[PDB]
Every structure is written in structure tokens, then in C-alpha cells.
Ligand binder design. Structure first.
Ligand SMILES: *[C@@H]1O[C@H](CO)[C@@H](O[C@@H]2O[C@H](CO)[C@@H](O[C@@H]3O[C@H](CO[C@H]4O[C@H](CO[C@H]5O[C@H](CO)[C@@H](O)[C@H](O)[C@@H]5O[C@H]5O[C@H](CO)[C@@H](O)[C@H](O)[C@@H]5O)[C@@H](O)[C@H](O[C@H]5O[C@H](CO)[C@@H](O)[C@H](O)[C@@H]5O)[C@@H]4O)[C@@H](O)[C@H](O[C@H]4O[C@H](CO)[C@@H](O)[C@H](O)[C@@H]4O[C@H]4O[C@H](CO)[C@@H](O)[C@H](O)[C@@H]4O[C@H]4O[C@H](CO)[C@@H](O)[C@H](O)[C@@H]4O)[C@@H]3O)[C@H](O)[C@H]2NC(C)=O)[C@H](O)[C@H]1NC(C)=O
Ligand SMILES: *[C@@H]1O[C@H](CO)[C@@H](O[C@@H]2O[C@H](CO)[C@@H](O[C@@H]3O[C@H](CO[C@H]4O[C@H](CO[C@H]5O[C@H](CO)[C@@H](O)[C@H](O)[C@@H]5O[C@H]5O[C@H](CO)[C@@H](O)[C@H](O)[C@@H]5O)[C@@H](O)[C@H](O[C@H]5O[C@H](CO)[C@@H](O)[C@H](O)[C@@H]5O)[C@@H]4O)[C@@H](O)[C@H](O[C@H]4O[C@H](CO)[C@@H](O)[C@H](O)[C@@H]4O[C@H]4O[C@H](CO)[C@@H](O)[C@H](O)[C@@H]4O[C@H]4O[C@H](CO)[C@@H](O)[C@H](O)[C@@H]4O)[C@@H]3O)[C@H](O)[C@H]2NC(C)=O)[C@H](O)[C@H]1NC(C)=O
Ligand SMILES: *[C@@H]1O[C@H](CO)[C@@H](O)[C@H](O)[C@H]1NC(C)=O
Ligand SMILES: *[C@@H]1O[C@H](CO)[C@@H](O)[C@H](O)[C@H]1NC(C)=O
Ligand SMILES: *[C@@H]1O[C@H](CO)[C@@H](O)[C@H](O)[C@H]1NC(C)=O
Ligand SMILES: *[C@@H]1O[C@H](CO)[C@@H](O)[C@H](O)[C@H]1NC(C)=O
Ligand SMILES: *[C@@H]1O[C@H](CO)[C@@H](O)[C@H](O)[C@H]1NC(C)=O
Ligand SMILES: *[C@@H]1O[C@H](CO)[C@@H](O)[C@H](O)[C@H]1NC(C)=O
Ligand SMILES: *[C@@H]1O[C@H](CO)[C@@H](O)[C@H](O)[C@H]1NC(C)=O
Ligand code: NA
Lengths: 97, 339, 272, 28, 49, 272
């Protein structure tokens, strides 16, 4: 198991994750925070080789990507009219997670 | 690119095995493999802790004082998100391929077009690529990554990560930042304020104190993020707070998390190469390992002149060999494959 | 329908009662329904009496089995404010109840209201001291699972090494009471078998023996659970007092009914 | 208000450490 | 910690710097014997009232 | 005698063989001894033939049961120098052997000499993949127990998630081979029962069916264990190669014997 700096924060206090409406939608938060122009150079002139070496180090250290059993889904509700995932304004697009 | 790093380390292990076979012709397969693995692990630890970490966190681990048997080195749940986001904020839209003579070659796309760089979103889980067919192509990828400047350490993510990350289920594309936020919620990660409090950092009470430089400029990401959280700073999650804290460096929360995690990893490891009690290396061998950098590994496995790479391949400074032609952007690169 | 996950995203239902009691009730209700269906086939005016007998018999059997498997022998319940979980100074207002049966103890922690501190508090945990089962191992597993503080406290109260000797006396009482109840159930089976035989006297004596064994189980449970030194159960600002639960009184009434039925059968045979 | 405003320390030493619940506990 | 230990070991614990969640505090097997003997070497034959 | 502790301070004995095989051998030897005792009661000159039949029958039965419970289907053994335990750089010289059976794998680590590094090295560990048994749980328990490095290595080689798919194929082969062997044992019981009946033809056909099922178990085990991709087992400076063990050849000879006996019985009946 992984360590914890703070006691686990769950909606039910055991395993149920905190989500909407108590927390903002993950896609809305990502669009609000991470949307911007590409091509901004690193202020420390760090290289891409360093970024992917760090990715290799992370793969060496931790791996929490593969799903567990039983299969639990925490789906990301795509807001209607999302430019990338809901271009047709369907309003029911859901990214499985 | 991650595959290129893996190939680099695989070739480094093979090269060390060949070196040890030359030094000890009588050694069997098992002994050669074990000695090569020991040396490669020591080199990997030295490069990751004393070269990559100081260059990418702007923080240096304290001087090694010995092995700590009673220190828990287990990876923390917060470290996963912190390291993942502090690295994903620097992923470029494309990657250059560089020749040994400071020549940036053209990249042949799967459309048969020629671009200036390898598009990241179109190379995910690539079984085969027209411009990646031999070992020399891997060497060119490594040199280009060494010469290319990464993205800015800020809240902005490229579309290759924000919109065209490999979708693990039912979708060829997904949002990596949204997936990371949903992972942090799944792992029960603490709030930004509680995470700061647990690490002894100064409490943040106003939204504009998260990143004073960010609020100084005309970027309204702080106000919009506060609006998304209904102005409740206590509900701000660890990942958005760490993303907003970054300015020229990972934010104090993420920097502290990664620094303490690596300190615990080094001190809590009995097989750390500097731990003289495990008998892995002698003092002279430990000095040799400390002197080894990633540039040495690249020179060794690529079989290239040392002057073709800067002494610290993690940071490119003026005067270093082969400057990048320009800071890469979405312009001029192949369009990401639709989901 | 597919294309989304999971296919059935609704909450998974929880069984609303004890499964052993539910199975016993279902089996005996099925037998009663079959007998009611065949009731018009019972010729003559005897059917009414027949019906009574059948019902009585089934009830007795069911009662015995239920009383042997129900954790309703020593019951107690308080309403308190108590600490809920570790790494949290918040307290919960809840009803804490103890249900000591023959084979173990059921500790109930029901929040008032159930939804407190953004958590559902309706715990009903079981800790068994049956032969071949290690109570200390179960308590250690409960500690590793992270059960709420009142549940862990009441479970540790019944550990074999706890200062107050509730574990030994309750285990002995439950074991021998269960043995006597199984003997009573076997006697009930034999009485049902032999009442069909021409010798009704032996069936009546077997029913009387069933009642006697039920009363003996009652007496043994009372005597073995009364010899215990006073173990003060203090939760929050209140004290939990245990008393003979519904299982004890059901055993009492069923054993008295069987004894009276056997005595009446013997007396009627002697007079007729 | 509740006079006991803190998390009462357990007598058995359990749950003292956040991730190592058996540290310092009885029987460890 | 701050009165008996300095007086009986002639050593003082370093200044408290905070709680360490990742430090194992379990009593070592060597500590049992060490403390037991360092205390038993000072047991008097008799005790005054 | 008392006044000292313990009363019996001698080393506690260890059983010198597998308990299931020992029990099977004891039961069949007891049956053989009873038959030898009653042998003079067998009247006439038939007794010799009778003796043969009895012996054959018993042997067949025993063989089947033994072959169903013996871990001697895929055997291999090497002599190597390997690391022994954690927190120790000392190496041991030992014979490391693998004994893959139907229900699991037995890993043997016998020191040469047994007394090395002031330790007794005669390990014979079992890791079962039988239905209802979790191999991963057993491997985790072995890791927590602290088994020597060769044993842990060979056990991890058979874990369900190990890169080489020995676990799935070996589990399937063992399961269906055991099922076929149980069918053969049932057919042997039926043949023994029906040979006493006047219809000897059906007894002969049942014996032939027993042989057929033994041969089918052999064929299924071979085909299912041959489809596996090559899993290199490398210990120290040597490689462990597995091959069909004594259980496989015992099954072969017993099945061939049963097939030939049934065929001869049918042919003799047809000719006479
Ligand atoms: C005397 O006591 C006896 C023992 O209690 C009693 O016998 C029992 O009777 C009852 C019926 O009367 C039965 O037991 C119940 O069974 C229910 C269903 O059991 C199945 O489901 C559970 C749930 O598993 C899901 O959740 C866990 C995490 O909680 C995950 O790890 C799982 O993977 C799974 O998750 C999936 O499903 C979720 C559903 O929403 C999804 O959200 C999720 O995404 C996933 O898709 C399984 O664990 C069970 O498996 C276990 O047991 C089997 C067989 O023993 C094992 O083989 C297996 O390996 C497992 O060990 C099974 O599959 C249970 O839900 C129910 O459990 C509740 O009660 C017990 C006892 O009080 C608690 O210990 C337990 O923690 C549960 O309490 C929590 O939840 C309830 C609401 O359900 C709350 O009211 C309660 O307060 C508590 O909430 C707390 O925790 C919550 C998180 O868990 C949190 O959200 C809250 O906020 C709060 O913090 C119960 O066990 C069964 O017949 C008997 N049980 C036995 C014999 O063990 C007997 O009748 C009593 N006698 C008398 C006279 O009364
Ligand atoms: C396929 O494999 C199958 C599994 O092996 C096999 O089935 C097995 O068959 C064998 C017989 O053929 C049987 O298993 C054996 O049983 C022996 C006796 O078992 C009883 O005793 C042990 C010993 O317990 C004492 O010691 C431990 C510590 O070791 C203490 O914790 C105990 O309290 C106890 O201590 C008292 O007694 C000591 C005696 O001297 C005193 O000195 C001491 O002061 C105390 O007074 C018990 O552990 C057993 O209980 C366990 O099992 C039962 C039932 O499963 C559980 O209910 C219970 O809770 C326990 O879990 C039982 O009571 C065992 O001795 C023997 O164990 C050895 O072999 C196994 C397997 O290799 C090892 O795992 C184990 O560690 C032992 O190996 C060590 O010791 C031998 C010498 O005895 C060495 O040769 C060996 O190299 C190793 O030495 C190493 O450790 C030593 C310390 O342990 C150390 O001194 C050395 O220097 C070295 O480091 C074995 O288990 C049984 O029938 C089957 N077992 C099953 C089913 O589990 C099957 O046949 C195989 N198939 C084929 C075809 O071959
Ligand atoms: C690539 O570099 C090699 C030597 O490093 C040189 O000979 C060759 O001409 C270069 N290729 C191009 C296209 O410049
Ligand atoms: C390591 O490098 C330093 C100079 O940077 C040199 O003085 C020292 O001898 C080197 N150590 C070894 C073992 O080569
Ligand atoms: C950073 O790299 C750019 C080229 O990408 C260069 O012009 C600049 O001088 C470098 N900065 C420093 C401080 O070396
Ligand atoms: C529990 O706390 C509530 C709120 O203060 C109080 O009204 C109630 O009387 C308390 N219960 C007991 C048993 O003291
Ligand atoms: C917790 O409970 C309160 C009151 O019952 C409710 O307002 C709130 O939405 C719940 N959830 C959280 C995460 O606070
Ligand atoms: C194991 O070591 C001994 C001692 O050096 C040696 O004689 C023997 O050949 C070795 N065994 C193998 C298989 O190499
Ligand atoms: C260990 O083995 C050696 C040689 O077999 C023997 O001389 C010695 O007495 C044994 N015991 C110890 C404690 O060294
Ligand atoms: Na960026």
C-alpha cells in the first residue's frame, strides 16, 4: 500500500470518492486551469529529455494506473458542448474512468 | 520517448555486461548479469537523485548520512499526483530528432508527410514509426530531447496531454488532467490547505496568495478556479493547487512532497549505493558512481563524442552544442488524430 | 444496454434481516403452505384439530431452531455520544446495543440519525466464540479492518484475555445451551415421527422431553451467565445493562408449552 | 460543547500511526 | 524523557522538532536488555524509609 | 518422572514420507494381509489365480489413488550454488527439485550437505492451485514466512501473474487429469463389484474403461503441459529441465495393464 501524508478524504469516509456537486467537474476544472497557448519555453531551460527521464523514474517508483477488482467506475461527466469530447452538444458524453 | 529512455537503459546494461565480460573472462552469465545490474542500479539512483532532481526541482537532497532502518520509504499517495502533474506540465507538443553533428532531421509522419518534429499525440503506444526504425533513430530521439527545451512549468498543458491522452476505455483519446483529478479523488487525496498544513507550510487564506506572480499578471485562472470552487479555498484539491502554485519551478507543496519522498526513498533503502553497510560497492566504486551523469550514459551507449552533449543534459544553457531550431508549438505539426 | 460502465450502476441491495432466521422462516412457511393446501384433503371434522397440531408442531420446531441460532439471549441497548473513528475527534450520537447469543455476540451501532459526519452508521458486527473459532483472531481482524470505537470496545470486552471473565462463562453457557437445544430439536423430530405411530404415549413423552430439554437449556444459560463477576460496560456517559432477551422468553414459553402438551397427553391417555 | 475536544488516545496503542496501526500496540 | 533520562544516562535528547509519522518507534530487542541491566546494576541491597 | 521441564525433551519426530501415500499404502497392505490370511479358505486350486486377481485389483486401485495424489507428474532436479536467505550474502550448495503434480507443486531444497551455514536444509514445500485454493495467497504467505530464496523463486515461477504461463496450463492439466483419474477409480470400483456378478463381460468392459480413462488422463496431461511456452528456470549457474516423472509412467503402465486385461477378458469370452 501507499503512504498518506493526510488521512484519506472520502465522501463516506471509507472508499467513496468526493465528487460533484461538492467538487467541480473534472473536465470543467481541467478546461479552466490547463487551457492555454502551447510553445511556452521552460523558465529554467529544462530539457524534454529531463521530463521523460523523470517519467521513467516515476514508472520505476509508483504505478497506480491499472484498474482494481472488483471493477469500479468513477466516470468523468463531460459538460455539454465540450469542444473536444462533446462537439455535437449531446449532453450525455461520459468519459469512462 | 519513454521507450527511448528504456532502450537507453537496456543498452547501458548490455554495455556494462560486455565491459565486465572483458574484465572477467571467466565469469558466468549469472555473475555478469548481477554485477551489471548492480552497477546500472547504482548509476540510475545517482542520476535520478543527484542530477535530475536538483535540476528539475531546484532543490537538493541533504548530504547522505547513512541508512535509516526505521524510516518508512513507501511512496505516498500525494507524491503520485504531485510528480505526475509537475512532469505533465512540461510535456512538449512535439519532439525533435537530432543528429550527432547538430543537424535536426525531418520527421516522416505516418501520412508520409515530413514535419520538423515528432508529434506526441500521434505517437502514443506506437507499434512502429517510419522515422523510428533503427538504433540510430533512437539515438537521434535522445539527442533531440537533450537539445529541446521543455514546456513552461505553469498551469498550461499541451493538447497532446489535455485533450489527446490515450483513452484506456471506449475512447481512443481522453483528458489526462481530468483523469489525474479523478484519480486523486479516487485515491482520497487531501485538500490543498490540509496538504499544506500536514507538511508544515504556511497556511494560505486567500485565493490570490496561492501564486502572487500569477495574480499579478492578467491571467484570470485563479479567479475562475475560485468561482468553480464557490470561493471555498478549503475545498481546493491538492492537484489544482499544486498546478496553480508552479512558477519557474514546482510549487512549494509539490516541491516539498517530492523532496521528502526522495529523501525517504534514499535514507530508507538498504540497497542504496552510498550505504557502505550493504557491501555493494567500495569507496572508490561509490566515487565512480557519483561521478557518473546521464551524459556519460548517453555517450557510452550512443558511442558518440562527449562534446556533442552538454555536461548536464537535463538543462540546456547558452553555448551548449546544437541549439534547438525554435521553441516547438502546435504550428507546423501534424494534427492530432481525432478521438 | 451497453456503451457505458457499469451496466448496472444502482446501489447493491442488502438483505434486511438475518439469513439463518429468514431461511428457517421460509422453510417452515413453505411447509405450512403445503399443509394448508392439502387441508381440504384431510377428511372429516378432524382437520381443525389436525390444523392446530400441525401449526403447533411447526411452530415448536421453528422456535427451537430460531432460538438456537438467534443472538437474542442477552440483550442490552443504550443511547450515547461516543468517539467514532481513529484520527478524528468528532463524536457521534448513536444507539449501541449488545446481543449475546449461544455462538457469539452481535454488536450493533446505529447512528441517531443514521447519517452522521457524512457516514452511514448502521453497523451490526458478529464475533463468534464457537468451538473451532478463535475469538482473539476475529477481534484482531476487526482491529485491522478498522471498526468504529464502540464496536471495538464491546468486542474487546468479550476477548478471552479481557480482565472481566464474560468470554469463558458466556462461551460455556452458549455451547451447552446449544447442545441442549439440539437435543430438544432431535426429541421434537422423534415426537413428530412417533405421533403418527399407533403408540401415542411415547410421542407424548417425547414432546414432554423436548419441553424438559428446552427448560434445561434455559436453566443452564441462566446459571452459567449469572455466575459471572460484574463487568461494567461504560460507553460515553452511560452504562450498558444486559438482560434476558426475546430468545430467552421464546425458549421459556415454547418449553412450557411442550411440557404442558406432553403432560396433558399423558393425563388424557391415563384417564382414557 | 463537548469537553473532550481531542481524539482520546487508545489504551492498546492501536491507530497511533496513520498507516502503521500496529506500531507500539500491545502484542506487536 | 527530560528529567530521568538526562540524569541517568548523562545524555539529553535533541530538541523536539515535530512528529515523525514515518519513523518506527517499536521497542528494539536490544533495548530491553540494555535498559534492564543498566537499571539492575544500581539496585541497592536495602531501601531507607 | 517430573521436577524438570520439559518432561520429554527429545526432538519431536517428523514423518518420513507423504501422509496420503502412506495411508493408501497402509490401507491396501491391510487388505492384502486380510486376503492372504483368508487365502487357505479359498477352496480348490483356483486360489493361485484368485491370489493374482486380488493382487492385481488392489495394485490397480492403489496405483490410481497414489497417481492421483502424488506430485510426481513433472519432475526435475539440479545441483546448484544459490543464495539461501535474506540479510545474508552466503551461498549454499544444494539440490533444487521441482515436483509438479495434479493439485499443486512441491519444491524441494536439499542441502549438500544438509548441514550448511549452521542450518538444516531439507525443505519440501507445497503450493496448491486446486479449485477453491488461491495460489497467490499461498505464495504471499510463503513470502511472509521467509522461505529460502530458491523455494520462493520456484514458487513465484508458478504464480498466476508470472510472465510465463505455467500456472494456467498446469492447473488445467492437473484438474482434468485428476477428474479422469477419479472416473477411472470409480470404474475400477464398478469392475470389482461386477466381476463377482455372473456377468463377467461387463466387468471386463469396466476394467477396459478404467484403462481407457487412465490413458486419457495421460494424454490430456501431456497435451495440456506441452502447449506451454518455454519457461526458463535458471538457478545459480544451472537450468532446471522438467520431464514426465514416475507418476506419469506408473499411470501409463497401469492403464496399459487394465486395457490389456479387459481386452483379453473380452477376447477369451468371445472365444469361449
Ligand atoms: C450478526 O452479525 C452478522 C455479521 O454482520 C450478521 O450476518 C450478516 O448478515 C448480513 C445480512 O443480514 C450480511 O452481511 C452484510 O452483507 C452486505 C453485503 O455483503 C456483500 O457486499 C459487501 C460490500 O462489498 C462492497 O463494498 C466493499 C467496501 O465496503 C468493497 O470492498 C467491495 O468490493 C464491494 O464494493 C463494490 O460494491 C459497492 C456497493 O455499493 C460499490 O459501491 C463498489 O464500487 C464496488 O462495486 C462485501 O464486502 C461482502 O463480501 C464480504 O463477505 C463475503 C462473505 O462473508 C466474503 O467472501 C468477501 O471476501 C467479503 O469479505 C458481500 O459480497 C454488506 O454490505 C454488509 O456490510 C455492512 O455491515 C457490516 C456489519 O455491520 C460491516 O462490517 C460492513 O463494513 C458494512 O457496514 C458498512 O456499510 C453499511 C451499509 O451497507 C453501513 O450501514 C455501516 O454503517 C457501514 O458503513 C461504514 O462503512 C461504509 C463502507 O463500507 C461507509 O460507506 C460508511 O460511511 C460507514 O463508514 C453486511 O456485511 C450477511 O448475511 C452476514 N455477514 C456475514 C456472515 O459476514 C448476522 O445476521 C447478525 N445476527 C443478527 C441476529 O442480526
Ligand atoms: C509436498 O509438500 C507438503 C508440505 O510440505 C507435504 O506435506 C507435509 O508432509 C510432511 C510429512 O511428510 C508434514 O509436514 C512436516 O511436519 C513437520 C511436523 O509438523 C508439526 O511440527 C511443526 C514444527 O513446529 C515446531 O517448530 C516451529 C518452528 O519451526 C514452532 O513454531 C512450533 O511451535 C514447534 O516448536 C516446538 O517444537 C520444536 C521441535 O523441535 C521445539 O524445538 C520447540 O522448542 C517447540 O517445542 C509445526 O510447525 C506444525 O504445525 C504447523 O502445521 C499445522 C498443520 O498444518 C498447523 O495446524 C500449525 O498451526 C502449524 O502451521 C506441526 O505441528 C514439520 O516439522 C515440517 O516442517 C519442516 O518442513 C516444512 C516444509 O519443508 C518447512 O516449511 C518447515 O519450516 C520445516 O522445515 C524446517 O525444518 C526441517 C527439519 O524439521 C528442515 O529440514 C528444513 O530445512 C527447515 O529447516 C529450517 O528451519 C528450521 C526452523 O524451522 C531451522 O532450524 C533450520 O536451520 C532451517 O533454517 C513439515 O511441515 C505434513 O504431513 C505435511 N505438511 C502440511 C500438509 O502442511 C507433502 O508430503 C509433499 N508431497 C510429497 C509428494 O512429498
Ligand atoms: C549526421 O551526422 C554525421 C556525423 O555525425 C554526418 O556525417 C552526416 O552528414 C549528418 N547528416 C546530415 C543530414 O547532416
Ligand atoms: C571524480 O571526479 C573528480 C573530479 O570531478 C575527480 O577528482 C575524482 O578523482 C573522480 N573520482 C573517480 C573515482 O574517478
Ligand atoms: C535558454 O535557451 C534559449 C534557446 O532555447 C537561449 O536563447 C537562452 O539563452 C537560454 N537561457 C540561458 C539562461 O542559457
Ligand atoms: C448526546 O449529545 C446531545 C447533544 O449535546 C445531547 O442532547 C444528548 O443528551 C447526549 N446524550 C447523552 C446520553 O448524554
Ligand atoms: C455531509 O453532510 C452535510 C449535512 O448532512 C451535507 O450538507 C453535505 O453535503 C454532506 N457532504 C459533504 C461532502 O459535506
Ligand atoms: C558449487 O560450488 C562448488 C564449490 O566452488 C563447486 O565445486 C561446484 O562445482 C559448484 N556447483 C555448480 C553447479 O557450479
Ligand atoms: C556451525 O558449523 C560448524 C561446522 O559445521 C561447527 O564447527 C559449529 O560448531 C557450528 N555452530 C556454530 C554456532 O558455529
Ligand atoms: Na506548461
Amino acid at each position: 500500500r501507499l503512504q498518506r501524508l493526510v488521512p484519506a478524504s472520502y465522501a463516506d469516509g471509507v472508499y467513496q470518492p468526493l465528487g460533484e456537486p461538492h467538487l467541480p467537474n473534472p473536465r470543467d476544472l481541467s478546461n479552466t486551469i490547463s487551457r492555454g497557448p502551447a510553445g511556452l519555453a521552460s523558465l529554467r531551460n529544462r530539457t524534454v529529455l529531463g521530463v521523460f527521464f523523470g517519467y521513467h523514474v516515476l514508472s520505476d517508483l509508483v504505478s497506480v494506473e491499472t484498474p482494481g477488482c472488483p471493477a469500479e467506475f468513477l466516470n468523468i461527466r463531460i459538460p455539454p458542448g465540450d469542444p473536444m469530447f462533446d462537439p455535437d452538444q449531446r449532453g450525455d458524453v461520459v468519459l469512462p474512468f | 520517448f519513454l521507450q527511448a529512455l528504456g532502450l537507453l537503459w537496456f543498452r547501458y546494461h548490455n554495455l556494462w555486461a560486455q565491459r565486465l565480460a572483458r574484465q572477467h573472462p571467466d565469469w558466468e552469465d549469472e555473475e555478469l548479469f548481477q554485477h551489471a545490474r548492480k552497477r546500472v542500479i547504482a548509476t540510475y539512483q545517482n542520476i535520478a537523485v543527484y542530477e535530475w532532481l536538483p535540476s528539475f526541482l531546484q532543490k537538493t537532497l541533504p548530504e547522505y548520512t547513512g541508512y535509516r532502518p526505521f524510516l518508512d520509504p513507501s511512496i505516498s499517495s500525494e507524491f503520485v499526483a504531485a510528480s505526475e502533474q509537475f512532469l505533465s506540465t512540461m510535456v512538449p507538443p512535439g519532439v525533435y530528432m537530432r543528429n550527432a553533428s547538430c543537424h535536426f532531421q525531418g520527421v516522416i509522419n505516418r501520412n508520409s508527410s515530413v514535419s520538423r518534429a515528432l508529434r506526441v499525440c500521434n505517437s502514443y503506444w506506437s507499434r512502429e514509426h517510419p522515422s523510428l526504425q533503427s538504433a540510430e533513430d533512437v539515438d537521434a530521439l535522445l539527442l533531440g530531447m537533450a537539445s529541446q527545451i521543455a514546456e513552461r512549468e505553469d498551469h498550461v498543458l499541451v493538447e497532446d496531454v489535455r485533450d489527446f491522452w490515450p483513452g484506456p476505455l471506449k475512447f481512443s483519446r481522453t483528458d489526462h488532467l481530468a483523469s489525474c483529478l479523478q484519480r486523486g479523488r479516487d485515491l482520497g487525496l487531501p485538500s490543498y490547505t490540509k496538504a499544506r498544513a500536514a507538511l508544515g507550510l504556511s497556511p494560505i487564506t486567500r485565493w490570490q496568495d496561492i501564486n502572487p506572480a500569477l495574480s499579478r499578471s492578467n491571467d484570470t485562472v485563479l479567479e475562475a478556479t475560485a468561482a468553480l470552487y464557490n470561493q471555498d479555498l478549503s475545498w481546493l484539491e491538492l492537484l489544482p493547487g499544486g498546478l496553480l502554485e508552479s512558477h519557474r519551478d514546482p510549487g512549494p507543496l509539490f516541491s516539498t512532497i517530492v523532496l521528502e519522498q526522495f529523501v525517504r526513498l534514499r535514507d530508507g533503502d538498504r540497497y542504496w549505493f552510498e550505504n557502505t553497510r550493504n557491501g555493494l560497492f567500495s569507496k572508490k566504486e561509490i566515487e565512480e558512481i557519483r561521478n557518473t551523469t546521464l551524459q556519460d550514459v548517453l555517450v557510452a551507449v550512443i558511442n558518440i563524442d562527449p562534446s556533442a552533449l552538454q555536461p548536464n543534459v537535463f538543462v540546456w544553457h547558452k553555448g551548449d552544442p546544437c541549439p534547438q531550431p525554435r521553441q516547438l508549438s502546435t504550428e507546423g505539426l501534424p494534427a492530432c488524430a481525432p478521438s | 444496454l451497453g456503451h457505458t460502465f457499469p451496466f448496472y450502476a444502482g446501489p447493491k441491495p442488502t438483505f434486511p434481516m438475518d439469513t439463518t432466521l429468514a431461511s428457517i422462516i421460509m422453510i417452515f412457511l413453505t411447509a405450512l403452505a403445503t399443509f394448508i393446501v392439502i387441508l381440504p384433503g384431510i377428511r372429516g371434522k378432524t382437520r381443525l384439530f389436525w390444523l392446530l397440531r400441525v401449526v403447533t408442531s411447526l411452530f415448536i420446531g421453528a422456535a427451537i431452531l430460531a432460538v438456537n441460532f438467534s443472538s437474542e439471549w442477552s440483550v442490552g441497548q443504550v443511547s450515547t455520544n461516543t468517539s467514532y473513528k481513529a484520527f478524528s475527534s468528532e463524536w457521534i450520537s448513536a444507539d449501541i446495543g449488545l446481543q449475546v447469543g449461544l455462538g457469539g455476540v452481535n454488536i450493533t451501532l446505529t447512528g441517531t440519525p443514521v447519517q452522521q459526519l457524512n457516514e452511514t452508521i448502521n453497523y451490526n458486527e458478529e464475533f463468534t466464540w464457537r468451538l473451532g473459532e478463535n475469538y482473539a483472531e476475529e477481534y484482531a481482524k476487526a482491529l485491522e479492518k478498522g471498526l468504529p470505537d464502540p464496536v471495538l470496545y464491546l468486542a474487546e470486552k468479550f476477548t478471552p484475555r479481557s480482565p472481566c471473565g464474560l468470554y469463558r462463562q458466556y462461551r460455556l453457557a452458549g455451547h451447552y445451551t446449544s447442545a441442549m437445544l439440539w437435543v430438544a430439536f432431535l426429541c421434537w423430530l422423534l415426537a413428530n415421527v412417533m405421533l403418527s405411530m399407533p403408540v401415542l404415549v411415547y410421542g407424548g413423552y417425547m414432546l414432554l422431553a423436548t419441553g424438559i430439554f428446552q427448560l434445561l437449556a434455559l436453566l443452564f444459560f441462566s446459571m452459567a451467565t449469572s455466575l459471572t463477576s460484574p463487568c461494567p460496560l461504560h460507553l460515553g456517559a452511560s452504562v450498558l445493562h444486559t438482560h434476558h432477551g426475546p430468545a430467552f422468553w421464546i425458549t421459556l414459553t415454547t418449553g412450557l408449552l411442550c411440557v404442558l402438551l406432553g403432560l396433558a397427553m399423558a393425563v388424557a391417555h391415563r384417564m382414557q | 460543547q463537548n469537553p473532550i475536544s481531542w481524539e482520546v488516545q487508545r489504551f492498546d496503542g492501536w491507530y497511533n500511526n496513520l498507516m502503521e496501526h500496529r506500531w507500539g500496540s500491545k502484542g506487536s
